[PDB]
């Protein structure tokens, strides 16, 4: 009996599932594409629920019309639905077809208060997301950012209650930064970063500067400032005194700054997840966050790109198990990425280790008792990619008589297009789904969810950080799947 091996497969809908005008205008095309997903046995779909579309008119002027039409179509296709609370800009980089900023009335606050945006050491403002520094600042016609997020989720729950009750909506992913990821905008691809630069620390907004000053004063070092020996976006670690091997990242001051920077992300996630848990209390849904996959520089001592993204991960410090520990009280899950990548596929100069990073994050989630799901980082249509995903989905292979010791709770494929569902691409994709399902038919009843309980007691940052050390080896992963596409 191999049923416990089944891993659900979701497919991300196009970024334009709802138009930039907040109208649902590609229903017939989508219905035809969803037929192909149903033919393939897919468990459900995933979609961005864009803040800039829904609350674009003004405060609390939510327009759910288009999303309700979309969700009805998905329900009528017999598919489940994962909804992202997308509190960030869609697109805005060079060549992006779909461009949806956060609400204009929110950005208008930035004219008199530009420090509502994450800001770099140059003073450049990133307009894709509101700094965590304004989470509890009542700057937005009397509301704080967290209040806006909570109110949006409340309105979503009220409007989408029938889809929740019917078992259509099964997961809520809470966007926590740029691209919906719990990170800083440290790698701004259209404004001065190119892969594989180290990135930069994006903590110069006046709110975060004041918070650092207070933190530094509480430990008797009022004079401390952010590190200045950090180079710039497109540097490599040895270009800098901070990130080089044996560099200043190791110093007392460096450790304090890195802990402060990464802790703020953890605290941001904790406070917003608490609000999300209160909103969805009693509904049969999983809450999730999305951790960015920063695989470049993983092989060097400083892990520089992870550090600037906000993940304080080193050889001897588990910067993902701390995040996982924070999620535990909420019974929140991790949605990770890079599930399709092999190390051999990456350029040498990027010092990139996606396989090891995936193993680290999955192992950290499992050690904290969490569900862990994953996505592919880049578009792939080939058997090798599918077989890499399969390995990561069941690291120990198939258990012949029960559940395996570890497995992904789900996989979400990025992303649906016409190209996916024709030709050889489609044949490869359908076989993948079969393999993820352990060669069983689709099970509409799989992975039932209990009504969501209230978050457990708030734990301090010090309690969360007990998870950082000692750093443990990952659980063993097979080199290759035992159930390949063929």
Ligand X SMILES: OC[C@H]1O[C@@H]2O[C@H]3[C@H](O)[C@@H](O)[C@@H](O[C@H]4[C@H](O)[C@@H](O)[C@@H](O[C@H]5[C@H](O)[C@@H](O)[C@@H](O[C@H]6[C@H](O)[C@@H](O)[C@@H](O[C@H]7[C@H](O)[C@@H](O)[C@@H](O[C@H]1[C@H](O)[C@H]2O)O[C@@H]7CO)O[C@@H]6CO)O[C@@H]5CO)O[C@@H]4CO)O[C@@H]3CO
Residues with catalytic function: 181, 375
- Span from 62-70, 82-90, 228-236, 373-381 in contact with ligand X (CB under 6 A): 373-381
Closest residue to ligand X using C-beta atoms? 195
- Would you give the binding string for ligand X spanning residues 401-420, x where CB under 6 A is met? -------------x------
259: contact with ligand X by CB under 6 A: no
Q: Where are the alpha helices (DSSP H) in 129-243?
A: 145-159, 161-165, 206-218
Instruction: Please name every residue paired with 289 in a beta bridge, in sequence order, or none if there are none.
Output: 334
Least separation in angstroms between CB 373 and ligand X: 15
480 is in an annotated binding site: no
Rounded-to-integer distance, Cα 415 and Cα 42, Å: 13
290 is in an annotated binding site: yes
191 is in an annotated binding site: no
Binding residues for ligand X, total number by CB under 6 A: 9
Q: Where are the alpha helices (DSSP H) in 3-133?
A: 27-39, 51-54, 65-76, 104-112
Rounded-to-integer distance, Cα 486 and Cα 478, Å: 17
427 is in an annotated binding site: no
User: Minimal CA–CA distance to 358: which of 332, 383, 335?
Assistant: 335
Is residue 445 packed enough to be buried (19+ CB in 10 Å), middle (13-18) or exposed (0-12)?
exposed
124 is in an annotated binding site: no
415 is in an annotated binding site: yes
125-130/117-119 β-pairing? antiparallel
Nearer to ligand X, 166 or 378 (CB): 378
Site for ligand X in 327-366 (CB under 6 A): none
Tell me the three state secondary structure of residue 3.
helix
Q: Beta-carbon neighbour count of residue 134 at 10 Å?
A: 21
16: contact with ligand X by CB under 6 A: no
Place of tokens 């097979």: 478
378: contact with ligand X by CB under 6 A: yes
Q: Beta-carbon neighbour count of residue 58 at 10 Å?
A: 11
Nearer to ligand X, 338 or 485 (CB): 338
Rounded-to-integer distance, Cα 1 and Cα 47, Å: 33
Least separation in angstroms between CB 448 and ligand X: 30
Q: Which residue among 27, 78, 138, 379 contacts ligand X (CB under 6 A)?
A: 379
Q: 159 is written with which tokens?
A: 């409007």
8-12/286-290 β-pairing? unpaired
Q: Which residue among 293, 365, 395, 404 contacts ligand X (CB under 6 A)?
A: 293
Rounded-to-integer distance, Cα 49 and Cα 439, Å: 33
User: Minimal CA–CA distance to 295: which of 279, 306, 283?
Assistant: 306
Rounded-to-integer distance, Cα 84 and Cα 397, Å: 30
295 is in an annotated binding site: yes
Rounded-to-integer distance, Cα 88 and Cα 176, Å: 8
Place of tokens 């926590």: 176
Site for ligand X in 176-195 (CB under 6 A): 179, 189, 195
Q: Which positions touch ligand X (CB under 6 A)?
A: 96, 179, 189, 195, 293, 377-379, 414
Q: Which residues are part of a known binding site for substrate?
A: 48, 88, 96, 290, 295, 337, 376-377, 415
Q: Which residues are part of a known binding site?
A: 48, 88, 96, 290, 295, 337, 376-377, 415
């Amino acid at each position: 009996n191999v049923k416990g091996n089944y891993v659900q497969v979701y497919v991300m809908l196009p970024l334009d599932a709802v138009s930039v005008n907040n109208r649902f205008e590609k229903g017939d095309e989508l219905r035809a594409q969803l037929r192909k997903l149903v033919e393939a046995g897919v468990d459900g779909v995933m979609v961005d629920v864009w803040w800039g579309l829904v609350e674009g008119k003004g405060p609390k002027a939510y327009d759910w019309s288009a999303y309700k039409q979309l969700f009805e179509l998905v329900q009528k296709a017999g598919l489940k639905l994962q909804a992202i609370m997308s509190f960030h800009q869609c697109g805005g980089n060079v060549g992006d077809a779909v461009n949806i900023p956060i609400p204009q009335w929110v950005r208008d606050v930035g004219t008199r208060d530009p420090d509502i945006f994450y800001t770099d050491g140059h003073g450049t403002r990133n307009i894709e997301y509101l700094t965590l520094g304004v989470d509890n600042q009542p700057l937005f016609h009397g509301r704080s950012a967290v209040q806006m997020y909570a109110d949006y989720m409340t309105s979503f729950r009220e409007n989408m209650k029938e889809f929740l009750d019917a078992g259509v909506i099964v997961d809520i992913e809470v966007g926590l930064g740029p691209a919906g990821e719990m990170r800083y905008p440290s790698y701004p691809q259209s404004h001065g970063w190119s892969f594989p630069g180290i990135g930069e620390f994006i903590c110069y907004d006046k709110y975060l500067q004041a918070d650092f000053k207070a933190a530094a004063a509480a430990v008797g070092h009022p004079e401390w400032e952010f590190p200045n020996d950090v180079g710039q976006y497109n540097d490599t670690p040895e270009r800098t005194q901070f990130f080089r091997d044996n560099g200043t990242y190791l110093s007392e001051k460096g450790r304090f700054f890195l802990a402060w920077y990464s802790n703020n992300l953890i605290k941001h996630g904790d406070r917003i997840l608490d609000e999300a848990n209160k909103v969805f209390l009693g509904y049969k849904v999983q809450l999730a966050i999305k951790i960015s996959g920063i695989h470049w520089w993983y092989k060097v001592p400083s892990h520089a790109a992870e550090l600037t993204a906000g993940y304080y991960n080193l050889h001897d410090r588990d910067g993902y198990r701390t995040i996982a520990r924070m999620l535990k009280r909420h019974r929140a899950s991790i949605n990770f990425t890079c599930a399709e990548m092999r190390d051999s596929e990456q350029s040498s100069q990027a010092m990139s280790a996606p396989e090891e990073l995936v193993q680290q994050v999955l192992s950290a989630g499992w050690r904290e008792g969490l569900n862990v799901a994953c996505e592919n980082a880049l578009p792939r249509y080939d058997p090798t990619a599918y077989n890499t995903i399969l390995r990561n989905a069941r690291p120990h292979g198939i258990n012949q008589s029960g559940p395996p010791e570890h497995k992904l709770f789900g996989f979400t494929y990025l992303r649906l297009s016409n190209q996916l569902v024709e030709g050889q691409n489609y044949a490869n994709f359908k076989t993948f789904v079969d393999r993820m399902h352990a060669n069983l038919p689709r099970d509409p009843y799989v992975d039932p969810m209990a009504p969501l309980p209230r978050s457990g007691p708030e734990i301090s940052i010090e309690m969360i950080l007990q998870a950082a050390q000692p750093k443990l080896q990952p659980f063993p992963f097979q080199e290759h799947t035992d159930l390949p596409v063929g």
